[PDB]
Design a protein around this ligand. Structure first.
Ligand code: NA
Length: 461
């Protein structure tokens, strides 16, 4: 990805956009009951904590575009991936406006809380004024589509979340690149069935895990993997994507029956952005908050890994490449050991910056003992080995519980954490519950005991 140009929005016919400048995050009732070193990310150029130019920092993710066209290895990757997907017998029909708006089997309704994007954000019109979850009205939406059309600029906000002291000091805040309600609706109508098919088929066929439920899915994953696992981390995945990778994606879509609407992918590739009083154009890079962001990054990941394996290990059997992606995150396998360090090398020629799995200093062998997916480990249950526990380290949960965005969501927030934590064992979970109950706020919460969560789990299969 690379920003072609940036200038005052007025100069190109656009209004100034208001992006919140004050974090809604602040110390929670457990701020001092648990350890933590994370704080709210920088949201404005004036934040006292900054140690470098903010603007420069948030846009530096666009490391440029390495490759220009789709080479021979990429084409092979496309054919193989498209071939697998073809077996899912995905419905290629467009999705009706109603379902694209309010949902259907395999596709959740549009999120009413998230932004309505441009121009609604500048007209003050919110999403709650356009759709009725119970009326399932599409009349208001239809007029809006006919009025403002599609391919609208993407509204950019800085994401309000916790970050390391380092990332805070270097202005490394992540950005929300929200598509207009019009594009989301249009794109969900164009790819709605593709999304549903993926959400319903997390595994090694779609090579995707978007829409999965870690509590149940973790027991299916091992069975799907080949003998030797391999993995690695990406540095600025989304932003590093070159235009060729988007073209590769269109070929897959074309081969599986969506050639009809590959133009929507162009909208992702060559994108239009609004930030504050500036507007900029990007060539390459996947927008962060577009309908399909997660699924398309995953499809592209499948193309990337297949390509690197073909470039590096000629004669490799992609039919025995068993991988599952979730955006840039990925867990993969092959009957034979492969060199991640080597793959990382080939990766640089494709505009991808790959590093050791889980922040290691060197490329070590990936095993069931140390592999993580979605920041979760894999641990067979002591009583029933065939049931696999998705284990997220307590550190993350601790960091999270020390802050709050709305005292009215304390019950949910803390309950969410409990569903993640208990997998660390009864001893750990109880220590967690006791610390929570060492202050008034925690003692008033309704939290599940270990026995309850363990039984709920066994009963969910
Ligand atoms: Na782009």
């Amino acid at each position: 990805g690379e920003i072609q140009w940036m200038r005052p929005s007025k100069e190109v016919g656009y209004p100034i956009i208001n992006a919140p400048s004050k974090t809604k995050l602040e110390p929670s009732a457990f701020h001092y009951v648990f350890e933590g070193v994370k704080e709210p990310a920088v949201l404005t150029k004036n934040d006292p904590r900054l140690k470098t130019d903010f603007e420069e920092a948030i846009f530096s993710k666009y490391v440029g575009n390495k490759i220009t066209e789709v080479d021979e290895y990429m084409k092979e990757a496309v054919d193989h991936y498209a071939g697998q997907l073809m077996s899912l017998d995905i419905n290629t029909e467009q999705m009706c406006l109603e379902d694209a708006m309010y949902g259907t089997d395999g596709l959740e309704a549009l999120d009413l809380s998230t932004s309505a994007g441009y121009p609604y954000v500048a007209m003050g019109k919110k999403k709650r004024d356009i759709l009725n979850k119970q009326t399932r009205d599409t009349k208001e939406m239809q007029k809006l589509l006919d009025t403002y059309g599609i391919n609208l600029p993407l509204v950019t906000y800085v994401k309000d979340e916790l970050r390391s002291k380092t990332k805070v000091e270097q202005g490394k805040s992540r950005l929300i690149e929200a598509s207009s309600l019009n594009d989301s609706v249009a794109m969900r109508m164009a790819f709605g069935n593709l999304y549903a098919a993926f959400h319903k088929n997390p595994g090694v066929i779609t090579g995707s895990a978007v829409g999965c439920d870690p509590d149940l899915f973790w027991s299916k994953i091992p069975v799907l993997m080949e003998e030797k696992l391999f993995a690695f981390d990406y540095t600025g995945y989304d932003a590093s994507l070159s235009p060729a990778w988007f073209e590769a994606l269109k070929m897959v879509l074309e081969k599986i029956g969506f050639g009809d609407r590959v133009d929507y992918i162009d909208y992702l590739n060559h994108s239009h952005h609004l930030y504050k009083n500036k507007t900029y154009c990007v060539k390459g890079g996947m927008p962060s908050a577009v309908s399909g962001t997660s699924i398309f990054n995953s499809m592209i990941n499948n193309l990337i890994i297949r390509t690197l394996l073909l470039k590096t290990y000629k004669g490799i059997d992609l039919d025995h490449l068993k991988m599952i992606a979730y955006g840039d995150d990925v867990i993969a396998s092959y009957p034979h050991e492969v060199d991640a360090s080597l793959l990382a090398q080939s990766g640089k020629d494709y505009g991808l910056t790959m590093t050791p799995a889980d922040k290691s200093a060197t490329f070590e062998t990936v095993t069931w003992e140390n592999v993580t997916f979605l920041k979760r480990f894999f641990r067979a249950d002591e009583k029933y080995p065939f049931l696999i526990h998705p284990v997220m380290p307590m550190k993350e949960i601790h960091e999270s519980i020390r802050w709050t965005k709305d005292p009215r969501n304390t019950q949910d927030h803390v309950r969410s954490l409990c569903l993640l934590a208990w997998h660390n064992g009864e001893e750990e979970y109880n220590k967690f519950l006791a610390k929570i109950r060492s202050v008034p706020i925690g003692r008033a919460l309704d939290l599940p005991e270990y026995s309850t969560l363990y039984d709920r789990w066994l009963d969910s299969f």
